[PDB]
Design a protein around this ligand. Structure first.
Ligand SMILES: O=P(O)(O)O[C@H]1[C@H](OP(=O)(O)O)[C@H](OP(=O)(O)O)[C@H](OP(=O)(O)O)[C@@H](OP(=O)(O)O)[C@H]1OP(=O)(O)O
Lengths: 56, 157, 237, 161, 138, 35, 18, 176
RNA sequence: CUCCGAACGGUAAGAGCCUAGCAUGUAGA
């Protein structure tokens, strides 16, 4: 099935591989689970501008 | 909050108690998970008593909100006694509650067939909130010490 | 499982106030190092102190000769590791016990940066003494047992790193001092001066007198007095 | 007197948001007091009443609140109150064709405690049950058959207030 | 707001009609605030402070200024505009500016005494920025 | 009868101070003779 | 050496505050 | 990951911030492909791109209840708990109707009733149609105005519970 | 003619791998 080369483990499902990705020692070397939000305005402004630019 | 604290306090994330005081499993998983679940006659009895309580209290809540008038609180207390028989909190907990239920149904038979002796007595109607306070107040009154002691041993566990 | 009447407390843990106010609690908080129910009572050691409590239970502390909330000692004031491995303790101890233990620990809201309580922080507004030294790292169970102390080695090496004697008065005489030097060795020229209440002694090649320098650094206690000792000339000045 | 509402404003627990070392006590003493339920079903306002009020005894933990007023009505007062509701109820059925009852579930079975719209209530459909006592015969007691909790709390004409 | 009395003010509530509405709006705005910033209990001091301010305003309008009638003061006490035990506690000569009613009960403190809110500042210590934990201030 | 009443109360519930610091207190925190 | 006492409340607390 | 996305930012009205929907629906939405792709990584601009990618309105469908991508985006927004300015900008953006519907649902879920009315009053004028998924999984045609009127009415939608404060007359007598 | 029942006695037995909802609030320098 799924294969994790970082841990070299065989995952029998998709949730096991997605879990092995982050939420483990591999994430601990990748910065563990910490992720914040990006500002408030500028993220939604640039996101809406890039989305409207790519759309049309 | 109380019973949900007991439920999450037993390291069992499979069940989610309805805030209208039911209990339903989530994952359609039992057997092994059910074998640490299906227990505690005290928890089922206490959930039953609070279920009747919260049915009463929420009935008066929507009364004082939006459809209180005279139909709702009267008919709801009456069918709340008849549904203490038919809907909620049934005999699975303790033995004699069927006897108090049958006395409740008979009292409802008396009060209805006399109060509907005239043109009013026919369909669903007022059916004065008179036996419910009395009957089930005495039933919880007797159940006070017994459910207290058994739930106290349950809290000790 | 363990009730008592009064705590086996320190003299510094109680506080620098002759009247404090305790609050007994029958069967509280579950003793730190043996896991047994005991009788927790806290108090306020003084004004703007830490509201100190009781950790280590009555049998826990009574058995191992230690106080119920600091685990140092009722007799001396040293840790339980120094007072076991190591006498030397009497010159190593201190009187006037510093009340730098009974003070509030560091406000973590201030360490992060936003202590909202302003001047009203009932915690303490200093900087966190850097993590690196193992005196940032001691615990209770390793402290309470003799095994692995961060303090007790650092104070046990204070015990081996580091003549004008005076304070004679009417207790020290010449024959007592020369017989207390006679167990160290023989004299070359000794004298006793009484205008300053002092004594002068020498030795063949020091050495033996060297351990007298180990014996008399405000430490040689004979006739019930802390003697005064500073260095001689040894320079023909 | 609003301290109950504000302290109970902690339905959840941000593990320290009224939630640090209070969760233990909150899970504990609730099973001491189901009896609070036996007082709580007691003092419910009767049909002849509108809403009135009650005493309440709150622990500072706020995980329990028994209703302390052991309900204490009078003899012919409560008799004529519930019987007045009987006469007005029967003649109410005589009049309307009111094809209505309540819902089975009084609220929906996923909802919250609904603390808000009667946390500031300001809304009482208080046309409850009082048959209009005609001021020719009932004149000895027109101020009497209208008090839910003040019926016995009359403090006048010998009530031992 | 609901009155639940059906009395309709004998002398009229018009005099202190607007001040009571502003106090109720301030109390609702204080109760609608979240538990952010307060450690365990620092957010509950504002409701008690607003209740103490409303009780002091009712005491100054009823007893001190002597403008409103006694029937209006009784209607405000029965409605909820002021407290009954606080008006009796502030009427004593020993204290007229108490912080709250949680510092006067002798069974509230664990040491079996009074709190620091009802204490003289001239008899206390010089350096003390302490405030009442159950009332809010001193 | 008082001892039996206390024992029965304990079974039903189950089923100032002046101490002179005469141990080490001599000059540290001087003035503590009765505490 | 500890023992009980029956000491003046007011003067105890007064000397404490002082 | 699935526990909470904010360490200490804010709280919900009367429940947990991550528990606004039902626990059975949360457990069903905890195991999905798009839900795992969102829980692997989710930012504000990533949520905006995920809202602009999928245009559908619905809840769970079929006997094996699987969440909709709009419900997954709503769960990720409820977990992440963004600021009110980003929600107001998403509700005010008329370019993406699905992102506007997601912002309206987030404002009706975690916002106050006065702010919900002030955000739903421009929402009633949007006559643009939108794709909707039925309970059996079949596609249904609807409009944004009907969904806004259903969100401004009592909670009858699936996997949603958001009561109001009072009637329109009582709220007009209380304030503006 | 209108007296309505609930649970236990019931789902196996394990092998290697994978992921989670919680809980304590300390004396020390
Ligand atoms: O069908 P009946 O034998 O004539 O008795 C019925 C019946 O009571 P019972 O079945 O318990 O004897 C109804 O209760 P249900 O079981 O049908 O729910 C009850 O109505 P309530 O629920 O309000 O008590 C009322 O019937 P009705 O709806 O007309 O009031 C009553 O007697 P009657 O039919 O003679 O009135």
């Amino acid at each position: 099935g799924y294969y994790c080369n970082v841990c070299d483990c065989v995952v029998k499902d998709s949730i096991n591989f997605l879990d092995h990705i982050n939420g483990k020692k591999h994430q601990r070397n990748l910065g563990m689970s910490m992720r914040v939000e990006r500002s408030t305005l500028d993220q939604v402004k640039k996101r809406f501008e890039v989305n409207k630019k790519k759309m049309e | 909050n109380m019973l949900n604290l007991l439920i999450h306090r037993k390291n069992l994330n499979y069940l989610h108690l309805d805030y209208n005081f039911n209990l339903k499993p989530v994952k359609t998983l039992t057997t092994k998970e059910r074998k640490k679940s299906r227990f505690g006659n005290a928890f089922h009895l206490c959930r039953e008593v609070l279920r009747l309580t919260k049915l009463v209290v929420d009935s008066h809540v929507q009364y004082r909100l939006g459809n209180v008038d005279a139909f709702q609180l009267a008919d709801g207390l009456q069918y709340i006694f008849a549904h203490v028989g038919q809907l909620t909190g049934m005999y699975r907990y303790k033995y004699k509650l069927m006897r108090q239920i049958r006395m409740c149904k008979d009292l409802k038979h008396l009060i209805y067939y006399r109060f509907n002796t005239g043109p009013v007595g026919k369909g669903p109607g007022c059916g004065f909130w008179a036996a419910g306070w009395r009957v089930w107040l005495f039933f919880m009154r007797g159940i006070t010490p017994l459910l207290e002691r058994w739930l106290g041993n349950l809290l000790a566990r | 499982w363990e009730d008592a009447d009064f705590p086996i407390l320190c003299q510094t843990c109680l506080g620098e106030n002759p009247y404090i106010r305790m609050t007994k609690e029958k069967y509280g908080k579950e003793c730190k190092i043996c896991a047994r129910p005991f009788t927790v009572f806290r108090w306020c050691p003084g004004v703007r102190m830490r509201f100190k409590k009781t950790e280590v239970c009555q049998t826990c502390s009574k058995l191992k000769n230690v106080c119920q909330t600091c685990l140092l000692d009722l007799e001396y004031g040293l840790p339980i590791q120094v007072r076991d491995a190591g006498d030397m303790l009497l010159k190593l101890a201190r009187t006037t016990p510093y009340y730098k233990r009974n003070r509030p620990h560091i406000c973590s809201f201030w360490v992060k940066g936003e202590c909202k309580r302003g001047e009203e922080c009932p915690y303490r507004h200093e900087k966190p003494t850097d993590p690196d030294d193992p005196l940032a790292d001691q615990n209770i169970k390793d402290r309470y047992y003799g095994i692995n102390d961060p303090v007790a080695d650092k104070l046990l090496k204070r015990a081996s790193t580091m003549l004008y004697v005076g304070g004679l008065g009417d207790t020290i005489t010449e024959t007592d001092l020369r017989n207390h030097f006679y167990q160290f060795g023989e004299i070359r020229t000794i004298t006793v001066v009484q205008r300053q209440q002092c004594a002068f002694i020498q030795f063949a090649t020091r050495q033996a007198a060297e351990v007298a320098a180990e014996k008399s650094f405000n430490k040689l206690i004979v006739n019930g007095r802390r003697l005064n000792v500073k260095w001689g000339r040894s320079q023909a000045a | 007197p609003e301290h109950v509402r504000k302290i109970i404003r902690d339905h959840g627990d941000m593990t320290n948001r009224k939630f640090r070392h209070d969760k233990r006590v909150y899970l504990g003493a609730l099973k001491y007091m189901p009896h609070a339920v036996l007082k709580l079903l007691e003092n419910m306002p009767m049909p002849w009443e509108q809403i009135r009020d009650v005493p309440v005894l709150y622990h500072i933990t706020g995980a329990i609140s028994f209703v302390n007023e052991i309900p204490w009505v009078i003899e012919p007062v409560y008799i004529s109150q519930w019987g007045s509701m009987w006469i007005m109820m029967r003649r109410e059925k005589r009049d309307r064709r009111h094809f209505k009852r309540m819902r089975f579930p009084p609220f929906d079975d996923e909802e919250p405690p609904l603390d808000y719209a009667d946390n500031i209530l300001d809304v009482e459909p208080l046309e409850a049950i009082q048959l209009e006592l005609d001021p020719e015969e009932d004149a000895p007691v027109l101020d009497w058959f209208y008090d839910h909790q003040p019926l016995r709390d009359s403090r006048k004409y010998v009530n031992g207030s | 707001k609901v009155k639940r009395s059906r009395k309709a003010p004998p002398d009229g509530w018009e005099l202190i009609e607007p001040t009571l509405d502003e106090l109720d709006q301030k109390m609702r705005e204080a109760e609608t605030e979240p538990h952010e910033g307060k450690r365990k209990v620092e957010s509950l001091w504002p409701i008690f402070r607003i209740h103490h301010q409303k009780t002091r305003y009712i005491f100054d309008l009823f007893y001190k200024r002597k403008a409103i009638s006694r029937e209006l003061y009784e209607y405000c006490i029965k409605e909820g505009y002021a407290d009954k035990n606080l008006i009796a506690k502030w009427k004593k000569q020993g204290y007229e500016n108490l912080c709250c009613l949680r510092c006067i009960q002798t069974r509230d403190t664990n040491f079996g005494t009074n709190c620091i809110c009802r204490v003289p500042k001239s008899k206390l210590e010089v350096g003390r920025i302490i405030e009442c934990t159950h009332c809010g201030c001193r | 009868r008082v001892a039996l009443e206390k024992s029965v109360s304990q079974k039903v519930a189950a089923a100032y101070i002046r101490y002179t610091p005469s141990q080490q207190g001599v000059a540290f925190n001087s003035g503590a003779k009765q505490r | 050496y500890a023992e009980p006492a029956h000491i003046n409340d007011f003067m105890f607390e007064q000397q404490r505050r002082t | 990951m699935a526990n909470r996305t904010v360490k200490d930012a804010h709280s919900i009205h009367g429940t947990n911030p991550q528990y606004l929907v039902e626990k059975i629906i949360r457990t069903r939405i905890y195991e999905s492909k798009y839900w795992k792709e969102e829980c692997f990584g989710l930012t504000a601009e990533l949520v905006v791109d995920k809202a602009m990618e999928l245009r559908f309105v619905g809840g769970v469908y079929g006997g094996n209840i699987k969440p909709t991508p709009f419900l997954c985006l709503t769960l990720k927004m409820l977990q992440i708990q963004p600021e009110k300015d980003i929600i107001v900008e998403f509700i005010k953006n008329e370019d993406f109707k699905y992102v506007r519907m997601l912002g309206a649902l987030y404002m009706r879920l975690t916002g106050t009733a006065i702010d919900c009315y002030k955000y739903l009053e421009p929402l009633y004028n949007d006559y643009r149609k939108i794709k909707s998924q039925n309970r059996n999984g079949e596609f249904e045609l609807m409009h944004v105005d009907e969904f806004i009127d259903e969100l401004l009415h009592s909670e009858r939608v699936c996997d949603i519970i958001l009561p109001r404060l009072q009637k329109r007359y009582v709220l007009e007598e209380a304030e503006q």
